[PDB]
Amino acid sequence: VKQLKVTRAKPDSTLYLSLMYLAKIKPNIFATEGVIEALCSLLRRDASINFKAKGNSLVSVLACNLLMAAYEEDENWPEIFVKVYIEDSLGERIWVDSPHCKTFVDNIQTAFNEELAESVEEYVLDMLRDQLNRRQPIDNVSRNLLRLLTSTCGYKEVRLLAVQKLEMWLQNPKLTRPAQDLLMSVCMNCNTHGSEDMDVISHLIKIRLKPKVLLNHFMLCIRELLSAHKDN
C-alpha cells in the first residue's frame, strides 16, 4: 500500500487488471474481504492529487453478463451474485440504451431474482432507500434508465413509487411516452388487487388530463383489465 501511494508518479495499473482475469476462473475469489478492505482504505478522497475515481468496468460487465449463461438452469444462487447484480445497475448505464443488449440486461435482472436471495434483496432495498427517499426530479431520469426500473418489477413498492408520479408527469409534455407506458404497466399489473395497486389507482383517479386520447386509452385499458379479472 505504501509503495502504491508514495510512488504515485508510476502507479501499478495491474490492481484493476487482475480483477477481470481472476473473476473468469474462480468466481468465489471475488467475495473475499481483502479487496473490500483495500478499497475502503484507499477511498479517502483528496482534491489536489489522488486517484479517487473508479476505473472502467467494461471487462467486469462483460464477465458478469457472460456468467448468466452458465447460471440459466441454476435455481439456487448465492447472495454474492445477487449483490453483484444489484451493484451492476448502479453504474453509468453503458449498454442500457442499446436495444441489442436487451437479453444481457434481462439475464442480469433475473439473476438477482432463493435461500439467501431474500436477505440480499432486503439489504439491496435498504441500501437503495437512501436514493428512494430523495425527491429527485422526473427530468433527471434518462431514457436508458427506464429499462432498469422496469426490469426489477417484482417489488411492489417500486411499482407503487413509479405509479405515484403518473399524475406528476400528466402535465409534462416531454413525458407523454412514459405516461403511456405507465398506463400500460398499470393496466397489466392490475391482477393482484393489493394495497399498492389500490393506492396507485386512487392517486391517479383524481388527476384530470386535458387531452382526450390518453384518458380514453387509460379507460379502455382499465375496462379490459377489469374484464380480465373476476375480483375487480
Partner: protein, 561 residues
C-alpha cells in the same frame, strides 16, 4: 519507494515588522531576504540536480495565512507569493517554526516514512532544509517579549507524540540572521568564515544539525548563500556520542549528517530503536528525532562477508571525521551501539562501525545486522561448511542469536538470507515488534494524517477576505476599507464615478452605449484593459497566438533576443 531525489527547500521568511529596517543598501531587510531567496535559487540552478527541487514558503503570519507555497504549489506561485510578502506582524518565530515543521511532517504518517516501531531506516528519507531568514530582533507576542525560543505544544498533530521533537531525522534548520547596519560598515571585506549568530534561533539550528549565519554585508550574504547551496544534501542527521573512556571535546558529541545516495535510495538494515519491542505494550515509546548513536574508540576489525547486503553511508565533514582521519587507522573500525536496543544491556549490542576510507578522505558508516560479530561468523559458516543446509548446533546458535535479535530486524534479515540463496532458513512470519493495539493506532493515525493533509493542502490558497473594517467604539457597525478585488466598473456602476469626473465619464459611457453599432460593448476602457499586470504586459509570445498566423515565405536581456 521513496523519492529522495526531490529535495524540499522550505523558506521561513520572517515577516515581522522588524524586517522593515533599512540597510545601507537602501532596501529593507525583507527586500534583502527576497533577494537572498532569488540568489539562492540562481546559485542552486547551476547544479543539474536542482531540477525537481520543491520550494516552499512559510511566514510569521497566522496558520491560515502562514503557508504561502506548500505541497502541490508550482514555482510560479512560489515566485508570486515571495514577491508580495509584507512585513507587518509580530516575531512569532516559535509558532511559525512549529507550523513549518508540521508542514514538513504533514504526509509522514500517511506514507509511513517514519517507520515507527520498526527500526529507523536512513533510506526512508524525505530530505528537507528550512532556511529561515530573519533579524536578531527579540521575539514578540501580543502579551510581551519572549527572551528565549520555545516551540508551542498546543494543538498537537496526530501522532506527534511518537517523536519527542517537532523536527525529524531528515530535516535541518538553517538561520540567515541579517545584521546589516544602516551605515556603510567601515570593516573591510574579510574572507574569514561566517560567524555563528547569537540569537535565540541558533540553539534550535544546532540541535537540528544545521547552523545559524550572521550577515552584516552583501559579501557575507553571498558567502552564506554559497555555503547553504553546498549544504543541500540528501541525508539524515545522526547524534553521534562517545561511549567509554578516551582512546568534553568537539568530537565527543556531534549532530553530523550521513549521506544517502539514491540509485530511489536502496538499503537493507535499519538503525536500531531506542527500546526493546514487546507485544503487550499498549503504546509505543517516544522517539528521539536524532538517534543517539554511541561509538567505542577501540579500533576493532571491520569484518565483512562476501555476499552480505551492507549499507554504506558517507559521513559529512565534522570534528569526529577529522579525529578519525587524523589518527590514520583505515584498517580498523570503531564499533557502534544504540543504547537500550537490547533485551537487558544498557549499551546494547553493536550494529555497525565507523571505518575510514582507504584514501583517508572520508569516514563511512557501515550499517550491519544487529549484534553482527555473533551473526556474521554463523552466516559465513552457513554457506561455507554445509552450503545453506543448517545443522542442529548451527540452528540452535542461530535461535540463541534470535533471542537477542529485535523483531523489527526480521524482515531485512529474511530478505538478506533470501538473496544469499537460503530462503527457507527462518519461519516466514510477521514481525512481532508491534502489538495489535499499536498497529491499529498506527492505521488510525494514518487515516487522521490523510484527512489533516487534505485539509492543510487545500487551505494554502488563502481563500479568505481580510477584515476590512474599523470596529466603531460606543464611547457591530464598522467603517469599511478599500480592497484589491473591487475594481471600479465605472460603466456598470454609477457609484464609482467621482464628482469631478462625472460629466466627461457620462459622455464616455453614453458613447460606449450608443456608438456600439458595429463596434464592441465592453466595460470601462483604460481600466479593465491597459491595467494589465506587469508580468503579462509584454508577453508577446502569448499575445501572438490570439492573432492569426502570417503566411510562410520560404546586459542579460532587453525584452527579446
Amino acid at each position: 519507494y521513496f523519492q529522495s531525489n526531490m529535495p524540499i527547500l522550505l523558506f521561513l521568511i520572517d515577516t515581522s515588522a522588524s524586517m522593515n529596517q533599512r540597510s545601507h543598501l537602501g532596501t529593507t531587510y525583507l527586500d534583502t531576504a527576497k533577494g537572498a531567496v532569488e540568489t539562492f535559487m540562481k546559485l542552486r540552478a547551476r547544479d543539474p540536480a536542482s531540477r525537481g527541487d520543491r520550494y516552499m514558503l512559510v511566514t510569521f503570519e497566522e496558520p491560515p495565512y502562514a503557508i504561502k507555497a506548500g505541497w502541490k504549489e508550482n514555482h510560479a506561485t512560489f515566485m508570486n507569493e515571495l514577491k508580495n510578502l509584507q512585513a507587518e506582524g509580530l516575531t512569532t518565530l516559535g509558532q511559525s517554526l512549529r507550523t513549518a515543521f508540521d508542514l514538513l511532517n504533514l504526509n509522514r504518517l500517511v506514507t509511513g516514512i517514519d517507520n515507527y516501531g520498526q527500526g529507523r531506516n536512513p533510506f526512508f528519507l524525505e530530505p528537507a532544509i528550512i532556511i529561515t531568514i530573519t533579524d536578531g530582533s527579540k521575539l514578540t507576542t501580543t502579551s510581551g517579549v519572549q527572551d528565549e525560543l520555545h516551540l508551542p505544544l498546543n494543538s498537537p498533530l496526530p501522532g506527534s507524540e511518537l517523536t519527542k521533537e517537532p523536527f525529524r531525522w531528515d530535516q535541518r534548520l538553517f538561520a540567515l540572521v541579517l545584521r546589516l547596519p544602516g551605515t556603510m560598515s567601515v570593516e573591510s571585506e574579510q574572507l574569514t568564515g561566517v560567524p555563528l549568530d547569537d540569537s535565540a534561533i541558533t540553539p534550535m539550528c544546532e540541535v537540528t544539525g544545521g547552523r545559524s549565519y550572521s550577515v552584516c554585508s552583501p559579501r557575507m550574504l553571498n558567502q552564506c548563500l554559497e555555503s547553504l547551496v553546498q549544504k543541500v544534501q540528501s541525508g539524515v542527521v545522526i547524534n553521534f556520542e562517545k561511549a567509554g573512556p578516551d582512546p568534553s571535546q568537539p568530537w565527543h558529541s556531534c549532530h553530523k549528517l550521513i549521506y544517502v545516495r539514491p540509485n530511489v535510495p536502496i538499503g537493507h538494515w535499519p538503525v536500531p530503536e531506542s527500546f526493546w519491542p514487546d507485544q503487550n505494550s499498549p503504546t509505543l515509546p517516544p522517539r528521539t528525532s536524532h538517534p543517539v548513536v554511541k561509538f567505542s574508540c577501540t579500533d576493532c576489525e571491520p569484518m565483512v562477508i562476501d555476499k552480505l547486503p551492507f549499507d554504506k553511508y558517507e559521513l559529512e565533514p565534522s570534528p569526529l571525521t577529522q579525529f578519525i582521519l587524523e589518527r590514520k587507522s583505515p584498517q580498523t573500525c570503531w564499533q557502534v551501539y544504540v543504547s537500550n536496543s537490547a533485551k537487558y544491556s544498557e549499551l546494547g549490542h553493536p550494529f555497525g562501525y565507523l571505518k575510514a576510507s582507504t584514501a583517508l578522505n572520508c569516514v563511512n558508516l557501515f550499517v550491519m545486522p544487529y549484534n553482527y560479530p555473533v551473526l556474521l561468523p554463523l552466516l559465513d559458516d552457513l554457506f561455507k561448511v554445509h552450503k545453506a543446509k543448517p545443522t542442529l548446533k548451527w540452528r540452535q546458535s542461530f535461535e540463541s542469536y534470535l533471542k537477542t535479535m529485535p523483531p523489527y530486524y526480521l524482515g531485512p534479515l529474511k530478505k538478506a538470507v533470501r538473496m544469499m540463496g537460503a530462503p527457507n532458513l527462518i519461519a516466514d512470519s510477521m514481525e512481532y515488534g508491534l502489538s495489535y493495539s499499536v498497529i491499529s493506532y498506527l492505521k488510525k493515525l494514518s487515516q487522521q494524517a490523510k484527512i489533516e493533509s487534505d485539509r492543510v493542502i487545500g487551505s494554502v490558497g488563502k481563500k479568505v477576505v481580510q477584515e476590512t473594517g474599523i470596529k466603531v467604539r460606543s464611547r457591530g457597525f464598522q467603517v469599511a476599507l478599500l480592497n484589491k478585488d473591487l475594481k471600479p466598473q465605472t460603466f456598470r456602476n454609477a457609484y464609482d464615478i467621482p464628482r469631478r469626473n462625472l460629466l466627461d465619464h457620462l459622455t464616455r459611457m453614453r458613447s460606449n452605449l450608443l456608438k456600439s453599432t458595429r463596434r464592441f460593448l465592453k466595460g470601462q476602457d483604460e481600466d479593465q484593459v491597459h491595467s494589465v499586470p506587469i508580468a503579462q504586459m509584454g508577453n508577446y509570445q502569448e499575445y501572438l497566438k490570439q492573432v492569426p498566423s502570417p503566411l510562410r515565405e520560404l546586459m542579460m536581456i532587453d525584452e527579446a533576443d
